[PDB]
Design a binder for this molecule. Structure first.
Ligand SMILES: [Mg+2]
Ligand SMILES: [Mg+2]
Ligand SMILES: [Mg+2]
Ligand SMILES: [Mg+2]
Ligand SMILES: [Mg+2]
Ligand SMILES: [Mg+2]
Lengths: 328, 333, 333, 328, 333, 328
């Protein structure tokens, strides 16, 4: 609620608290810390390998050995968690997305390796069929090319179970099938994975901002499962279902173009609330900074926005650069 | 909000997403051309057009060229322009006198447009930053601090001069405390009964204004200077409601949040709490980052309408956007 | 709040508690050094340091010693000090004239600090209790009652003298009705445009101020006297909202609850209803009880940060705390 | 909600009602009475025994015969209920916490004795494994030393049933296992203990304020079941679950450092709401009073705080001293 | 309110009802003697006591007898009396001049009580109905309508006279628009800084005042007259919030609902919306109906405390009740 | 919600609308009509019989033939419903309350008679064991004299079914057993009584105002099932359960001493909300009117109070007198 309390110029001058650095610090409503940051990482199949991504300047795909080397620095910076995104070899893609639950799939191998080397580092796996399907569709298709809901869930459940077996502390379904959070929850509980967190992509929109991601993972209609950008009330129904179904955290994706959604979600549910600053937001920002059009300070500014809007944690490709700025 | 015990599989939220016709029926918000305001950079002189490297596709234009281009903006149905003059270097001063010159660029441009296109809205910029040698939004004391009340005296003269030139809307972008009331009191006194005041109510001390400062040429004046003693801390949300409340008490006809996309949560809170006409500026840095990504082939041209739909969804009534023409074109077609 | 039908075993709230990394991600509030204000007891004279038996570890300091100690407070990043002068006995009077002496301890200390540490916030104490022979916060009528409006006249002189000495913030701790408005009107008139007024809005007639009254030396003056005709009844919560509402209407830049931990529910209500910068005093008695338990080995040193985290969680923007240095040290390390 | 109603100085002078004792009494919002008070008591195994506790000055551990003697005075003062805390002999501690449900365990014996002698006195037993485990962990441990949730619940249920058999009118689970209120409720109902109250420790924090208690009971990580002190929204989810699960009362612990939590709980749920002024709060206050740093009046002041914040009842080591002050 | 999915048999609300100790723990409200105000009918003369047939057990008393009885009211801890004078017939007039007579019964009684019992609260009645020949609460125009502003002029004189006699609280029971502000402005001007104003804010045009009109002797004056042009329509609830809002804006220290039990829903709305000190009058008709039933053996004496507990539960801070002594006796024992 | 809208004297003068009868009528917020009225009636076992009740002046007990004669007038006045209260012969009272479900019990006979003669008249039967138990206890007793919850429900269900069989359109459980609304609902549905309304006595208080009723029915502790008069929040939990359990209407009893409860119930649930102006409220009012202490107008005034507080219907012994005043 809001009560203006009859405040009026000149008795009230809001510039007074702005006058000095010390008073600005005292009244500052929100601060970003490294504990708000999650780093998404693109993981290759090989050894001794890194690759640059044309539409995501400065982001590398890394083989698992290279991932372990870089995680030393991420852990030193205090980054609490990584979000793993495998770059599936084309030979391993299929109509049935079976690679999703392969015990020696990239995500499963990367998870085992990280859990052993850095036991305190959070590993959030991606529960999703798009990296494993022949054309990059987000699930199993019917004769009309429609992504079947419940049949896709069956595969997502096997995948989530395989991640839990590999040691993942958090599984993060990014698929937008109806009811999948509940299905995954019933399977994790039945299997005795009682502490495995489910970070639901609850209000994920049918967005043009995912363009560069598809270059990153090598996966390059969605309006039949991802949300219409026009819709806000609908996001509340999505999150309400996911919390009833057992999610430990709920996410809004994309991020900055949906800050109003972050605010409403946090205000209405008062649950742990996450947001993804996606590949397109990263690319636009990094592009402008590299062109000398925007100052490097826009990085923190965009991240501060998430905190102010109500987010508990941010999946961001800027995580390491932000961590280094926060530290010094 | 009441969830009403809705539960899978009785409730499957993909059912409404199944077909175009049903997505359309349930669609919560739609952008139209009546939501669009085009900011324009206005040069002195005749037959002048200048590219802006940090705003690819945007041109500074002399008044003659402005009048020509406005034919298609009007044909597109764009309801209003926000004018931003590019002050010649020699007209910048300590006292910012050029702000209220009846022969200033902003004043000349307003008279020309009001005569040529009587139905087109003209929103003038009330601000001293285009006219100061230091590039700060007001008059400095001997410590280099921007004096609040003394700066308002100049802003008042400026707003009065815009009303005299025929501007239907004056928009104070300065972030002085109390200037909405001061300007409103001056307009009323002078008989400018229906001149609208579009307050920049919750304008943040942001890094996203870089390309604009290049465009109007205040970048070299400002140098490394900042506006943290008047523009708002990016961290602060509750404070925005206090800013808006005062501007409404002071007589604003419209209230605005700036920047736009990095502050959509502020747009939402402001529309929810006050239920007043609420405006948002998609600023130069926002424009530049989208255009850069599009020209690189990193983002599809559809992001333009996606970014604008967000403002509508968040609660905005109108959007100042350098994409206005491209958007109106795409909405028309 | 909507529970969203969450139910065991689908919802197990221990899952987020399982690992340090996930506890960290979901952590709702974190104390930083920018939340801390250090109250300091200031003696007259030179090279003076005095222990306080009821506040183990806290020293009264002369200005010279204050300036030395402040080097490490600034190095620690502590944003502000709240100054509390220890008035010599012979300077106490019926009329509390010493309150506005330009050569009073508070005034001398402010000038010295503002010159030495220009970025350090100085919050002065607007109050007559250090200066009266009876120890009450104002001027007595012939029934021994603290006169409201006549006391304000003195508080106004005092606040003006602090502004003249350079104090960025004046903090009226007196609990006279209407004094925020009176002081604000005086500051504005005199041109002190940006001097902040941190109102002690909801200050309770509490027993937890004992050690402070010892520290500043008002204990012997007050004797068995009480402040129930001005400070608030501990029983009353709704009344705090009326106190805050008035202080905001009167121009306060910040509003404060005192004491702190025994009144966390008041902090919560005040931040929830007004959404204004909200401050809380962890008072001398609170300090003393924690330090006593720690020195006895009854409570671990971690209670310090636990007690301060509570203020943040409850809604406080800033905390006046005698633990500021120990806390800043522990946050730094 | 709040409406300021345009009240303004000098028309409004809030000191007017403060002018006189009579008007202060008329407008006084909250009062503490003895019916708000619950006395926690430390119960020894022997006969003819009392012991002092170094970190809780003035508090005695008492054998059951001594407990019955002292309860005469507590009953005379009108104290409605005791909260029993057994001091387990070290020979009776085990990995399996079996002493928790022993029909002749201290708590069970004390309960039978009190129920017979003072039939109108409320007896609130502590449902908890920490007094009965070899090292004082709050439940049954896995190989990694993690407190297993559901397996601990099994023992807590047997304990709660044994308390109900002994005659306890209220059982009070202080363990912070997920779902235990529901488990205890299903067992009490199945067993025909239909009027046995469950007072849930709903929002119990991982606190440094419990130090002296561990000296009192002879039990001297918790962040994996007790709440992070930083978290407020989370307390609402905890209480919502406990009410759905069948709790008759909900509690916040510790007390004064969490008054904001008391306020939110009472405001949101409007259910019987309890608060524990824990051993550390008692010790700090009593210490300062004994040192001559704080006046005895801080006792009432701290207790009045609970009432004002929304608490229906307070577990306090000051109960008897407060009862004597309230009476005269 | 959130039901939190509570469901039989997991939730059995009789469990807390099972034992006295648990009912006590969960008990939401408890009446104490500090909630009680005793209205008293005061006669002229010496050694006068008169029974009231319609208020069985209540006596009109001369000042001397009042002073004697007050010894036990004070011993019982009753915080305040509300004085109601029984004006001699010959002192009633068109102009209600007796209202402000310094030697009126109300004024004499106040002086006597303030001297004898300095800690006892005295609430005087600001109203013209005891003093008019027609029995209406003010001055009539030539159509027989009660003039609003002209009546306030008299009420102001009356309130001033009560403040002069030493009354700590004046209570305007007249229901003129704006009289709270008028009286407050007069008190402030004259230096009566701390005289409380207990507004009868939402006082209904009720039939339950019959026995009171007999008690003070205004019944024969009023005859068949009604007060529907000033007292509120019994049908109206929303209107009460507008009445209260104005009285608070005008400076009331306490707001009151009258009658009491037939208007408990109004007590609840008023306390919920404003969170101010809220008072309720258990009127003469309410007293009479309870006492009649008790004396008939139709209702047990326990209804007295039940009826008073209701006011507390509904949100009242204090209750004017002719049962004050019987209640204080029963609470004491 | 409430917004004062800065209204201020003298621009705002609330007496303006009060100036004239016409403007008072236009702005009048609530009106009582006969459709708000329910008449409770005391029904005797015999023929050709009426009896006066000492503590309820002007109220008669009536045999069924006399009830049918009087109902002609009640129906002519437009009174929508009667609430039947049998006066059980002492020979028919028992420990097991079997008379409660007797097909030829007074309530069942009265119901059949009225349903046949006046098919449009609402008949609300009382579901309750107190008229049928040996000493007037509100249910079946254990060895300690405690009213057993679930075992009493079994009898209440058989009674409710017998009322439904007799033709009653509404059954009204006045017992305050936990969960009885649900039990009665499951039985009515199973038995095919799908349109039988259940009017729950949801927030019924342990009150002294029931004194004269006990004289009326010949039935002359309750704190273990009826609510503590001190408790308001608790009434919300009571009504929430009864609506979840299937009640078509919810009631607050007693009436005028609980108008705040009526207001909260209607505000929070927005469901059909009833209130009982009980025998003690009737007696106090009628007593004062007969003594010449209060004018007859207090009857309407008290009834108007119910409407204003949020009640949809009022059980009142004044129903006929009020109906005649409303008509003319
Ligand atoms: Mg979904
Ligand atoms: Mg502003
Ligand atoms: Mg104040
Ligand atoms: Mg729990
Ligand atoms: Mg009025
Ligand atoms: Mg019930």
């Amino acid at each position: 609620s809001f009560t203006p309390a009859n405040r009026a110029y000149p008795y009230t001058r809001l510039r007074r608290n702005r006058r000095d650095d010390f008073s600005r610090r005292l009244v500052r409503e929100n601060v970003l810390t490294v504990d708000d940051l999650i780093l998404p990482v693109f993981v290759l199949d090989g050894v001794n390998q890194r690759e640059s991504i044309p539409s995501m300047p400065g982001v590398e795909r890394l083989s698992i050995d290279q991932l372990l080397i870089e995680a030393e620095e991420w852990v030193a910076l205090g980054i609490p968690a990584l979000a793993l995104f495998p770059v599936t070899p084309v030979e391993k893609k299929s109509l049935d997305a079976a690679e999703a639950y392969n015990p020696e799939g990239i995500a499963q191998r990367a998870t085992r390796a990280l859990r052993e080397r850095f036991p305190e580092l959070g590993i959030i796996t991606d529960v999703a069929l798009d990296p494993f399907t022949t054309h990059g569709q987000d699930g199993i298709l019917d004769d009309d090319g429609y992504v079947l809901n419940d049949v896709s869930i069956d595969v997502l459940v096997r995948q989530a179970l395989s991640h839990a077996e590999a040691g993942a502390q958090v599984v993060a379904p990014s698929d937008m099938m109806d009811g999948r959070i509940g299905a995954i929850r019933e399977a994790l509980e039945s299997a005795g994975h009682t502490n495995v967190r489910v970070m639901a992509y609850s209000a994920k929109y049918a967005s043009a901002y995912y363009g560069p991601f598809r270059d990153a993972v090598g996966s390059a209609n969605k309006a039949t499962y991802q949300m219409d950008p026009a819709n806000s009330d609908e996001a509340l129904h999505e999150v309400a279902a996911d919390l009833a179904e057992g999610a430990d955290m709920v996410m809004v994706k994309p991020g900055m173009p949906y800050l109003d959604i972050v605010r409403r979600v946090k205000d209405e549910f008062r649950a742990p609330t996450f947001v993804y600053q996606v590949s397109g937001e990263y690319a636009m920002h990094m592009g402008a900074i590299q062109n000398g059009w925007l100052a490097e300070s826009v990085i923190l500014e965009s991240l501060t926005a998430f905190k102010r809007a109500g987010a508990d944690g941010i999946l961001t490709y800027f995580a390491k650069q932000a961590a280094e700025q926060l530290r010094r």
